[PDB]
Design a binder for this molecule. Structure first.
Ligand code: ZN
Ligand code: ZN
Ligand code: ZN
Ligand code: ZN
Ligand code: ZN
Ligand code: ZN
Ligand code: ZN
Lengths: 131, 150, 286, 136, 109
């Protein structure tokens, strides 16, 4: 009873219980990618990788680096702010290459339906110069 | 009425004469537009200021925000684009989208053209792919990240 | 989806792409034709002409690497075609063998953009197509008198192996060795009295690793393996013999269904029972 | 030592359509053979294994396999749905019965064996992802 | 020979009713660990009923195999009531154990 109270999981599965989850899930993910379902393979691989991390690099390399600008006052706080809403950006950003300005994903998907230049007004045509 | 003063004084002040009152009116109207959550009108006002601050030569005399962030690659620790699907300084492979397995391209804005890079887990997806994934999910799609990017 | 007189003289391969949306038909007319096969419509796209000889096989690359189609022909030149902005164009040339290149097949996408080039002089070559800095194709003498087919083993998890069918009554399994930086021989399989025409590995591995080797003595052997490193169980597909020479073997993408291609212009389908008796499961003729 | 050139062949696709070409002009035809393939695209478009309860995944899969005329798969999902029933209140005997080797785990092991012999990779990986998503 | 089929169908139907009643009376006192067992037994009986109406190793959802496995889990855990209930209801139609073991279990109960 105490051990059941000390268990947040519905089941205490092990690798001995499911010996071949990795190969079967990976092969079905390949079969799902051969169909027009590219999100289901990501879901099933996320489940498999979550269990693999539970009992124990194609998406690496690029790290986003803030420009270490020697500032004194509010522009230190205003460096890490979105250029559409002036809120702090921390997840799911949009970065241009010609001008080094952030946007939120929602702010970018709202602004580029109606705008053509950078919302900070630097004169950069970000739909044609973000590479 | 600071609205009319701002919209009139942006036509000629930073192009011709630096005065503190116009800057006060511009900042007050931008803070008012942010107060009413009219962010689109603030952005249009800023791009109109940048259009109307251009001289006869073409030099922009308005005050713009300094450069904020840039993308590294951690193999040569340089910028991947100069202000291809490979780094232009060390040739290392760019990370792929987690959905369609397509890499980053470096060389009217469609959604399926830019990566929506998270600044916490540093994992990138196309914006259409990120919208399609994060609409029905709340975790990073990469195998081994726990970061709610949306 | 019925296509009539796609090529003027003869046909050698017709390989669907990864999504089942584009079909690459090659022939002896030195021509490769791309068809959009969405729905029942089979609208032609392009009429690629690069080869100086009859074209044997083509193989689409993964969409991970883009719209890339490899090709092999009688002249020993491996031509590689990429469609950029709707404009199909040749990119790279792989002419390393002194005879006709017989089999071309891309590696599984976990291994990178690697091409299995097998030629009729008994030599095979695995070549990588990355950027402008192309790699040296590693060449090993697979067979003594000739190699007519070469197919890859699937990457069920996130070493690399490929089957190699020769012209000297043999089927050879090759394994990558990191110390030698090449492919070393793993096992040697002898079950044929004639030239092994097509060797095909099963893309799905549930409790067994299947093979399908066909040869000119009108027979089919299904070589299975229970463990990761174990002996191969040789078993027949028919108690009798096939009417004509067997050319091709193409496994189903999920579920071990085998599509043979005899010399009588007749595709025979085979599906295993629960016991292990290879009952026929269909037939396509003309 | 170039072999005799071939004139016919085949190329499978992910939906079970067998694209066969033939010689005597040249003819390319496609024949549907999805009934010989256990894994079906129609179930993957309707299976759910994350955005519900652990009982909800198996009940939804049972309904999907029932509406597509798959009796054994529907009964397997129904039995797994019965074995994954929980409630708002927490009693320890449900956890003790779940962690027992002769319940749930035995069913999953025997179902993996049975669907290995039936060559059903879709049902194998679906059983694995449901039993791992039910773990929480 | 149709009378035997009709008797078997009626036996399956009122055994489904008995299983539903047992599941309900377990759910009355809120012990889900045996309500799940009787729901499994009810659905196995419904599967057998639908295959009687419609008319290598056995699957784990086969009626005899699943009922025997639930019996074995009950007699290993120590649930006397559940194993004895299964021995009354599903012994003649599904030969679970020997007659000696079943009769000894009923006598001990
Ligand atoms: Zn924003
Ligand atoms: Zn900008
Ligand atoms: Zn820009
Ligand atoms: Zn670099
Ligand atoms: Zn993408
Ligand atoms: Zn992440
Ligand atoms: Zn993130």
């Amino acid at each position: 009873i105490i051990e059941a109270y000390e268990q947040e999981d519905l089941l205490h599965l092990e690798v001995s219980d499911i010996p071949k989850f990795q190969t079967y899930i990976y092969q079905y993910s390949k079969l799902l990618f051969r169909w027009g379902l590219p999100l289901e393979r990501v879901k099933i691989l996320k489940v498999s990788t979550d269990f693999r991390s539970s009992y124990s690099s194609p998406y690496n390399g690029v790290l986003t680096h803030w420009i270490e600008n020697n500032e004194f006052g509010e522009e230190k706080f205003l460096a890490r702010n979105c250029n559409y809403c002036d809120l702090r950006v921390t997840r799911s950003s949009f970065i241009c290459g010609n001008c080094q300005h952030v946007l939120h994903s929602s702010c970018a998907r709202i602004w580029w339906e109606i705008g053509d230049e950078c919302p900070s007004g630097c004169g950069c045509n970000c739909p044609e110069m973000f590479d | 009425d600071v609205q009319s003063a701002a919209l009139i004084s942006i036509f000629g002040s930073p192009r011709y004469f630096r005065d503190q009152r116009v800057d006060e009116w511009i900042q007050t109207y931008r803070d008012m537009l942010k107060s009413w959550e009219l962010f689109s009108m603030r952005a249009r006002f800023d791009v109109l200021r940048s259009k109307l601050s251009r001289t006869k030569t073409g030099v922009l005399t308005a005050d713009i925000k300094p450069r904020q962030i840039y993308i590294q690659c951690q193999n040569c620790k340089q910028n991947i684009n100069t202000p291809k699907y490979c780094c232009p300084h060390c040739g290392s492979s760019f990370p792929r989208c987690a959905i369609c397995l397509m890499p980053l391209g470096t060389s009217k804005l469609k959604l399926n053209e830019w990566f929506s890079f998270c600044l916490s887990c540093n994992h990138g997806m196309h914006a259409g792919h990120a919208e399609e994934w994060f609409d029905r999910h709340n975790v990073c799609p990469t195998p081994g990240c726990t970061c709610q990017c949306n | 989806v019925v296509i009539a007189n796609a090529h003027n003289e003869l046909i050698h391969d017709a390989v669907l792409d990864y999504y089942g949306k584009r079909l690459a038909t090659c022939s002896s007319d030195k021509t490769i034709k791309i068809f959009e096969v969405e729905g029942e419509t089979h609208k032609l796209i392009d009429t690629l002409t690069g080869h100086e000889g009859p074209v044997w096989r083509v193989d689409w690359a993964h969409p991970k690497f883009g719209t890339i189609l490899a090709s092999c022909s009688y002249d020993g030149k491996v031509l590689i075609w990429k469609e950029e902005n709707g404009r199909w164009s040749q990119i790279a040339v792989h002419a390393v063998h002194s005879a006709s290149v017989n089999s071309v097949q891309w590696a599984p996408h976990e291994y990178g953009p690697l091409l299995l080039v097998a030629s009729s002089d008994g030599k095979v070559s695995v070549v990588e197509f990355k950027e402008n800095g192309t790699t040296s194709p590693i060449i090993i003498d697979a067979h003594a008198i000739g190699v007519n087919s070469a197919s890859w083993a699937p990457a069920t998890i996130e070493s690399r192996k490929f089957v190699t069918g020769g012209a000297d009554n043999l089927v050879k399994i090759w394994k990558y060795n990191s110390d030698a930086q090449t492919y070393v021989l793993e096992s040697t399989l002898e079950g044929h009295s004639d030239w092994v025409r097509d060797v095909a590995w099963s893309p799905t591995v549930l409790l067994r690793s299947y093979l399908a080797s066909v040869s000119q003595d009108r027979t089919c052997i299904i070589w299975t393996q229970d463990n990761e490193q174990g002996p191969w169980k040789k078993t027949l597909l028919k108690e009798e013999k096939f009417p004509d020479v067997l050319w091709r073997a193409s496994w189903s993408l999920s579920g071990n269904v085998l599509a043979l291609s005899g010399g009588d212009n007749k595709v025979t389908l085979w599906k295993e029972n629960l016991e292990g008796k290879w009952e026929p499961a269909g037939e396509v003729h003309q | 030592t170039t072999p005799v050139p071939n004139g016919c062949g085949s190329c499978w696709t992910a939906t079970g359509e067998l694209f066969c070409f033939f010689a005597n002009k040249n003819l390319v035809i496609s024949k549907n053979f999805s009934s010989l393939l256990s894994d079906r695209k129609e179930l993957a478009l309707e299976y759910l294994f994350m955005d519900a309860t652990p009982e909800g995944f198996a009940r939804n899969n049972a309904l999907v396999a029932e509406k597509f005329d798959l009796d054994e798969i529907s009964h397997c999902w129904q039995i797994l749905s019965d074995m994954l029933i929980d409630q708002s209140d927490y009693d320890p005997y449900t956890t003790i019965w779940n962690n027992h080797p002769m319940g749930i785990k035995w069913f999953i092991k025997e179902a993996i064996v049975y669907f290995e012999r039936q060559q059903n990779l879709q049902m194998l990986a679906m059983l694995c992802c449901v039993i791992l998503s039910a773990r929480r | 020979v149709e009378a035997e089929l009709q008797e078997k169908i009626q036996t399956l139907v009122d055994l489904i009713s008995i299983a539903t009643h047992n599941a309900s009376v377990y759910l009355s006192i809120d012990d889900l660990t045996n309500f799940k067992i009787w729901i499994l037994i009810r659905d196995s009986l419904l599967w057998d009923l639908k295959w009687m109406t419609s008319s290598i190793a056995d699957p784990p959802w086969d009626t005899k195999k699943l009922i025997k496995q639930l019996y074995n889990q009950a007699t290993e855990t120590g649930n006397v009531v559940l194993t004895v209930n299964i021995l009354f209801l599903f012994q003649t139609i599904y030969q679970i154990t020997e007659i000696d073991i079943a009769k000894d279990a009923i006598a001990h109960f």
